[PDB]
């Protein structure tokens, strides 16, 4: 089993560097001092590789962030999701029970606070991957952002449940209204990725403050505060483009979405001063990433790991 | 490791002693007055023990009044920004040795190769550390240099220090003329 | 010059095939051709829909009138509602 | 506050000010001493080269050091060390101080006494050692 | 135990007589005793290789690189002392790479440094340039902000979107660090925020900090208590709206209720507190009978007895 | 009804620096393998 | 709170070390003691081979055996066996010790004295016992 | 306002084993008879 | 602290000039 | 207030008429 767990290992650290390399297991090197390869071998190691991080000699910041990049470089099939969808239901069940206690433990709540802990470094990759549980997002932003302490949102919830809302407007009619009214602007340009999260958050502020005013308030600053938006250069600046935050880091460093802006900026400035009839046309950003025309006719494709691999060689470039 | 001298030990063992011949016999009653075969080969073993920790203690206490020596030493700025810095370190360093005060030659090899890493957030740095670089000692009874024994990734944050100083001095006179 | 930033933009992009605006926005190869009867053409005519919201019954099949119909009705009595709010009403004052 | 010199602190912020120097030197030297003593034997138990450590032994030996700093008097210490280095009273002897450590203005201004001495090595001495600025030292470099 | 299969290899033919048979000692019992003590080895052999995984995975994110070398280098000695057999193959050339990627990383540092160190001195030179167009753009020049051109030259160096939102954060904490009366610090922001284009570094900022006092207050009222230390961002933006009212109104006008809270703590004369019990007490009933619409605001406004709401 | 005395502080040197930075651009990579 | 050794604990927690070492000495022996009788009772009333007890008494036996182990001095107590299944004093007769117990080392200096006899058995000596190490031999078996 | 003392834990000794597997493939029959 | 004691030797080997 | 203090010289240069 030692012997055995090099190669999976090998097979990650050259994936998490810009590579594909199937991690199918049945497409793994044989050989006398391991034997064959069965799928609990593809599970074990997750949790080899998790037990191994939470014993190193390094700040918890390091260790957080080594988490969350092992696990945005997996594919659809690996270990490491179906582990962090297990604690992410795990988390959302231990907070059920302690609202209906009514009592906050410290010693009972404490796989809601390792999510917690690993949720800080990136707070958009969790929520386009599991949009399904978007009301436990919402707590940790009202106890890490605003301040509140988490006694008093339980009594708070406890008094929400007998006078019950329901003043109708959930019935999947009003979202479309409420997305295109005149006065809510920025509700307008929204990427597909976090659609399907605005919907929970904003049912949770409704359910527990009551108001239904509040909670396109309370929307708008989480969306503003998860994108990225890109402005003309006219003297009266109007948006072009509204994109995601993780569609733009480069390495593993929970502050690398600053170079992607910057070589897409480039980018749209070289596009429009080499060729001279864009000028009458509207060079925009949808969402991977597009700069299209407005006839459609330009259009050109960007990605994390080509962006990536060249900044590290042009920066290795300049030596000696 | 708990006492500090022979005559803590020795009361202990005796009120222990004491205590457990009385609880062992009259566990199975028997009678107390009715234990001494091996004592030479007991005692033997328990002052070797005393004697190598208390070894061990005064080991360590040399070595904090080195390092408060030094750490003094380290402070002074115009002994640094003068030209001749080395000579002194050396010096101290061979009359420690000759006199013993060092232990062995491996705390040489330690406190030699500390004094660089602490020299980097000092004033007078880059001076000491390059006008250091070319003297030889001899250790182990082969002979090597200063930089043999290490192996300039210092040299390069002992200028970045006064960099940053300057830059700081460029802010400073900015912020005063913008409020005046 | 490339060292800055150059290199790494224009190395970077990728080309790819033109858009089609047409087929995106109205998809129009989904249209079924079958000509109405008197009588599928009297029951919307009973219905009670107004002119200007014919435009979800075309293109279907025969098969699924009905549901058609209601969507017409349900976003016909949306609009009424929200009339008689008095939403459009502040174009008379200049 | 029952504590021995916890309560020593209670009575300065009650009294004082009038309370004479030797009861303000009893009350004051004790939370020094006890710093002192635990930062002593505290540091006295880890290993000297840093690249030997752990990681919380770092910090708090970095953080713990401190306490023990001196910064006037170097001088004074490393003046014997070079000595040694370059070569290989009873304050009447000196010139421009009196008996009661007082200056004499009568030999300053006859005997044109160039230089006042504070310490040994003022008498003579080649080894030079002469005041510098920082500000200058750094902009040289750069 | 640590050292048993030698023990029961050797006791094996012990010949003793017990009760007139004569046999040895196998005899009185009749292999399941041997291979566990085999295994009590294989232990220990797994124990060692899991550790020296850790310790050569760990050396190795060290933030200093002059520092895991050190312990990559005992590890290696440690190795070569045991002299182990073909079994720990695996890991002698895991301790190589290792022991040569720490070696390079070492030889990069250095230029990494040096131009860490040249950096420094160009950041203020890129600064000063930045400051005199908004100088010159505050006495009625248009002066075209943007950063794609700007007299570049030897001492600054290139320049990219990010120095903007640098420079607006150095010069919002520089004006409050002079020594002129507390009115003036207040009256240089709102200046400098009425003179940019829509896309200035300064609009957002501001923006940001709206939204940050409006969560404020929101908490304030949910917890039922007004604390001062809590509440840092809310009295911050109070004391720049007072200077400029009218322009705020215009520039945000999504969360004008905030304004409506600050007006009356300053003109009236309420204290902070009892509007917070206020909104806490009218939280269960709603005054919201029908009312709020876009038919009562019309035929709201077009009145002549109010004179004022008449005309807007 | 009381006389405080206050105290002075022994100087401490922890060697001057300009302010940092608000995005503080860095390396793009986290440890020594490269 | 008023059994005689669970006032010791609980005054040796409060005072300290302030007093003598005998009172400490006794403080800690009390419960140490009853320790000791209370295992030892428990064990006589058992069986000795592990395959005619029940599960519960095997488990309990397991669990509380262990408080009895030693591991300093077990060669100076297996010292005596060896030498007659082989073969078939007064510190001054020692060589490198002296009569107080401490390292003599005129002869040590002087004489190039090959080792020292801490015990017995290292007059002449045919038993060798020769110094492993855990981890040689298990690499070795595997 | 005490001065504690801690006490020296008694050694133990239960031999070093590595870390537990989480999926545990053993045998799929209890009981001696087969 | 005090990872494990250390068992006392039968006898001890030293060297000499 | 409270600056940085100042060591203690170790010759002090005067002058005359």
């Avoid at chain 2, 190769?113 to 007078?124: E, H, Y």
């Avoid at chain 4, 030996?61 to 009873?90: P, S, Y």
């Avoid at chain 6, 300009?18 to 860095?26: D, G, Y």
Wanted: net charge negative; proline share 3%; charged share 25%.
């Amino acid at each position: 089993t030692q012997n055995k767990q090099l190669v999976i290992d090998q097979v990650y650290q050259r994936r998490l560097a810009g590579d594909n390399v199937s991690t199918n297991y049945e497409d793994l090197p044989v050989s006398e001092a391991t034997g064959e390869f069965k799928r609990s071998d593809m599970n074990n190691y997750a949790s080899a590789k998790l037990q191994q991080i939470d014993q190193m000699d390094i700040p918890e910041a390091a260790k957080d962030a080594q988490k969350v990049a092992l696990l945005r470089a997996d594919t659809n099939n690996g270990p490491f999701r179906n582990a962090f969808q297990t604690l992410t239901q795990d988390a959302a069940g231990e907070w059920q029970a302690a609202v209906i206690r009514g009592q906050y433990d410290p010693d009972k709540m404490q796989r809601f606070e390792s999510l917690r802990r690993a949720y800080t470094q990136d707070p958009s990759s969790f929520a386009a991957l599991y949009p399904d549980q978007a009301q436990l997002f919402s707590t940790f932003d009202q106890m890490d952002k605003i301040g509140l302490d988490p006694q008093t949102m339980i009594e708070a919830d406890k008094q929400a449940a007998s006078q019950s809302r329901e003043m109708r407007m959930e019935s999947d009619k009003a979202w479309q209204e409420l997305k295109n009214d005149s006065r809510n602007k920025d509700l307008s340009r929204l990427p597909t990725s976090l659609d399907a999260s605005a919907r929970k958050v904003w049912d949770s502020w409704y359910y527990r403050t009551g108001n239904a005013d509040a909670a396109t308030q309370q929307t708008q600053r989480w969306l503003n505060e998860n994108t990225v938006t890109f402005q003309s250069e006219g003297s009266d600046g109007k948006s072009i483009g509204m994109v995601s935050k993780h569609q733009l880091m480069v390495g593993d460093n929970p502050e690398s979405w600053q170079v992607g802006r910057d070589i897409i900026d480039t980018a749209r400035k070289q596009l429009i001063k080499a060729n001279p009839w864009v000028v009458n046309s509207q060079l925009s950003v949808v969402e991977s990433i597009f700069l299209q025309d407005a006839t459609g006719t330009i259009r050109i494709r960007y990605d994390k790991e080509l962006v990536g691999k060249l900044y590290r060689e042009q920066q290795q470039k300049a030596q000696d | 490791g708990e006492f500090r001298t022979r005559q803590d030990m020795e009361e202990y063992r005796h009120q222990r002693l004491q205590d457990a011949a009385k609880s062992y016999a009259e566990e199975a009653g028997i009678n107390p007055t009715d234990f001494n075969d091996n004592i030479t080969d007991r005692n033997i073993a328990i002052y070797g023990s005393f004697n190598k920790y208390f070894s061990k203690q005064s080991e360590e206490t040399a070595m904090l009044n080195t390092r408060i020596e030094m750490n003094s030493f380290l402070n002074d700025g115009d002994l640094m920004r003068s030209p001749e810095s080395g000579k002194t370190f050396m010096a101290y360093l061979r009359d420690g040795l000759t006199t013993a005060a060092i232990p062995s030659d491996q705390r040489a090899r330690e406190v030699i190769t500390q004094t660089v890493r602490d020299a980097i957030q000092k004033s007078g740095g880059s001076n000491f550390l390059q006008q250091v670089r070319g003297e030889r000692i001899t250790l182990n009874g082969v002979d090597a240099t200063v930089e043999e024994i290490v192996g300039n990734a210092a040299i390069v944050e002992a200028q970045g220090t006064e960099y940053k100083l300057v830059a700081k001095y460029q802010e400073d006179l900015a912020l005063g003329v913008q409020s005046a | 010059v490339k060292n800055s930033m150059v290199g790494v933009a224009i190395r970077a992009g990728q080309t790819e095939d033109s858009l089609d605006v047409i087929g995106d926005v109205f998809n129009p190869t989904r249209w079924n051709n079958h000509k109405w009867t008197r009588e599928e053409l009297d029951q919307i005519r009973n219905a009670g829909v107004l002119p200007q919201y014919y435009g979800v019954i075309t293109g279907g099949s025969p098969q699924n009138l009905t549901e058609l119909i209601n969507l017409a009705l349900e976003n016909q009595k949306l609009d009424q509602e929200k009339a008689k709010a008095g939403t459009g009403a502040q174009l008379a004052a200049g | 506050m029952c504590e021995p010199v916890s309560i020593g602190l209670g009575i300065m912020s009650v009294a004082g000010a009038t309370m004479s120097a030797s009861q303000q030197a009893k009350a004051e030297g004790a939370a020094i001493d006890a710093q002192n003593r635990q930062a002593q034997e505290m540091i006295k138990q880890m290993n000297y080269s840093d690249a030997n450590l752990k990681m919380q032994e770092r910090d708090l030996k970095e953080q713990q050091m401190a306490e023990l700093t001196e910064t006037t008097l170097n001088g004074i210490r490393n003046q014997g060390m070079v000595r040694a280095a370059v070569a290989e009273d009873t304050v009447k002897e000196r010139a421009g101080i009196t008996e009661s450590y007082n200056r004499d203005y009568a030999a300053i201004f006859g005997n044109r006494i160039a230089n006042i001495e504070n310490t040994q090595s003022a008498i003579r001495g080649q080894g030079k050692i002469i005041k510098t600025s920082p500000l200058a030292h750094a902009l040289n470099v750069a | 135990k640590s050292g048993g299969s030698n023990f029961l290899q050797q006791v094996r033919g012990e010949r003793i007589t017990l009760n007139g048979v004569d046999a040895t000692v196998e005899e009185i019992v009749g292999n399941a005793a041997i291979v566990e003590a085999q295994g009590t080895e294989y232990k220990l052999v797994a124990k060692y290789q899991e550790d020296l995984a850790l310790g050569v995975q760990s050396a190795i994110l060290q933030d200093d690189p002059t520092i895991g070398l050190a312990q990559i280098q005992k590890l290696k000695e440690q190795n070569n002392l045991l002299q182990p057999g073909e079994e720990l193959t695996p890991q002698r050339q895991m301790l190589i790479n290792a022991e040569a990627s720490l070696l390079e990383a070492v030889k990069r540092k250095s230029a990494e440094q040096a131009k860490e160190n040249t950096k420094l001195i160009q950041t203020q030179n890129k600064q000063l340039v930045i400051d005199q167009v908004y100088q010159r753009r505050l006495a009625g020049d248009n002066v075209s902000t943007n950063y794609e051109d700007l007299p570049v030259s030897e001492a600054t160096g290139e320049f990219k979107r990010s120095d903007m939102n640098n420079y607006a954060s150095a010069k919002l904490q520089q004006i409050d660090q002079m020594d002129i009366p507390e009115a003036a610090k207040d009256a240089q922001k709102v200046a400098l925020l009425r003179a940019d284009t829509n896309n200035g570094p300064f609009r957002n900022a501001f923006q940001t900090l709206t939204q940050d006092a409006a969560g404020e207050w929101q908490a304030a009222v949910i917890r039922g208590q007004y604390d001062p230390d809590k509440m840092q961002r809310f009295e911050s933006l109070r004391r720049a709206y007072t200077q400029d009212p009218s322009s705020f109104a215009a520039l945000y006008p999504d969360q004008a209720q905030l304004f409506s809270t600050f007006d009356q703590m300053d003109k009236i004369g309420l204290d902070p507190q009892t509007m917070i019990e206020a909104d806490k007490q009218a939280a269960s009933q709603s005054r919201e009978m029908r009312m709020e619409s876009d038919k009562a605001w019309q035929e709201l406004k077009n009145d002549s007895r109010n004179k004022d709401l008449s005309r807007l | 009804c009381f006389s405080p005395k206050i105290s002075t502080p022994k100087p401490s040197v922890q060697a001057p620096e300009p302010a940092p930075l608000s995005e503080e651009v860095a390396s793009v990579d986290i440890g020594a393998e490269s």
